[PDB]
Design a protein around this ligand. Sequence first.
Ligand SMILES: [Mg+2]
Ligand SMILES: [Mg+2]
Ligand SMILES: [Mg+2]
Ligand SMILES: [Mg+2]
Lengths: 339, 339
Amino acid sequence: PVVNVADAKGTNVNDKVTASNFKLEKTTFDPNQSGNTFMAANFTVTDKVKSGDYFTAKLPDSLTGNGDVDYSNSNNTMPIADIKSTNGDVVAKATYDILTKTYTFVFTDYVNNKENINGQFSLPLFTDRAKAPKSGTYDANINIADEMFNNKITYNYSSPIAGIDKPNGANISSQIIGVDTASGQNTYKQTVFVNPKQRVLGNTWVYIKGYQDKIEESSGKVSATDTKLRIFEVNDTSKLSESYYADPNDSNLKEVTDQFKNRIYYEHPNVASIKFGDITKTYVVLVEGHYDNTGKNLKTQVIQENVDPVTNRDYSIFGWNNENVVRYGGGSADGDSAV
Amino acid sequence: PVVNVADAKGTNVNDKVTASNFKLEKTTFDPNQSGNTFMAANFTVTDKVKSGDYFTAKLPDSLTGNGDVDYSNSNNTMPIADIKSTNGDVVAKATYDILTKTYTFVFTDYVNNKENINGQFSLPLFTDRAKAPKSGTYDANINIADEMFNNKITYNYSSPIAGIDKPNGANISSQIIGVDTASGQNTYKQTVFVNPKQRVLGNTWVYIKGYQDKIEESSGKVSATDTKLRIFEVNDTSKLSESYYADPNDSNLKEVTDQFKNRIYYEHPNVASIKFGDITKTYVVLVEGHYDNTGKNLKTQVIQENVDPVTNRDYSIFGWNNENVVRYGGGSADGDSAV
Ligand SMILES: [Mg+2]
Ligand SMILES: [Mg+2]
Ligand SMILES: [Mg+2]
Ligand SMILES: [Mg+2]
């Protein structure tokens, strides 16, 4: 069904581009607390190039260019600030391919009959919650125009394992690891860890709220129509990530969603209630919800409540907050050509 | 020397654009603690327009589109995310004029033979530290395509008047109210309030550091060549702004910079030392410095130290931190046309 694709286009000119003066803002941070970094580099075009010629930058397993901003509803492509000339003309158009973690800078006409083309650029960088699942240090070697710039980044993820300091106190945690702020659909992906302490909890209930204290302060929309939940039993809690990334097809997870057919209730506005009952294992709840158009930050709160299995007393409750900005500067407009 | 200018261009088409569904993220915040807001609106083109036609948005006295990001070294013009089509083509180019607090959206060719052009856009909004000097509520009425959208914003500026809780304890405050992250010059504007408590301080010294604890953690560059200081005596401290905006030509300020010819020392790396001596009035120090290219956040720390005028004892010292991000995604490149 056709032939080669290797982005042939106006041909790759990484062989005519030299990156230098590579800098990283910081090499240690906590992605669970808005922690992220930045990169900057200089680049000079060593030979004559044309409009349509392009050079690239590739990210290693440990990094992503989009972070918690989901672009799956945008062809899995992330728009990037272009490199501009003093006049303001675009010297090159920038785009980030989520799948190949590759940045593509395509030169415009400005490059036609020009020499000594020299400049610089900086880009935001984040953790790859899926490939850097645990806290620790990773190689973060970056490739710019077929040149390597070695780095080492340390991720100190705030631990997902948290709760009341009591032998069998309530304990739950969460993190919104995906927010679509560009497509217009306004979706978000959130991972919830119920009982990551692996304690024995009686008559436990979990609440996933689309707000924290004031419903009007959050854009979150949690309802039977706006929210989709999938529940999994964790076999080995220590194999559970600290970045909250959780693949529904993970072998360490046993999906028990069906068993919860009638254990999920939408009793109160913007609140999904889950009846877990007596449990001893850790559970993962994969949330796929939406937020409104008020532009308010997406604020969520997960609560876990329970009593002692044996005495049905010794009540305990624990809560965890989440908050992601939904802001997406710019605008969108579309019209139809006249008949 | 010529004629009219009123941005004639491809003519103003505000008369063919209707804004609606106006929303403000929040109406109350603290600009001294990263407090700012956002606006969003829908817009439809009511008549046929061409490439080059443009509509505008005007901000009231209480707001600015740039905030603490200085654009004076960029023709006092602020680049703004364009309005894109599904295809990704630019429906309109956006630009913000700092001077006239006006946003100009210029339609491209995409608009030529099109109808039902409909869309939306959102923009960051900040306080006008100069026109909303004091904490309180102001009218924040915004004009979009010759249509008004009334608002009321309340600014709770963290008070500049702070220091040791002692009849004559050290007391100082500051705020970086201007950072140039686009031109390449890397300048910053910081206002310092020395003794805003109007206490009587003996043998007082003030230190303006371009870092906080670790010199390597900040991009700040404070030195005889990188820093320029102007010192003013405050006549009525209550007339002093809470947003830290301080015009050197303000009537409430008496410049005593010359008198400090030999009272300013650069003894320690990244630290400017000022010998005030015995003082009772409040002083304003206008700082014009630079930061390096490490991309590190601009972190500063101002310290005030003193003893009791009468006993030359009862030592006191107070410090104040500042921190602004220097990050400016994107890139710059320039070449020369070949001979
Ligand atoms: Mg190369
Ligand atoms: Mg257990
Ligand atoms: Mg109009
Ligand atoms: Mg006094």
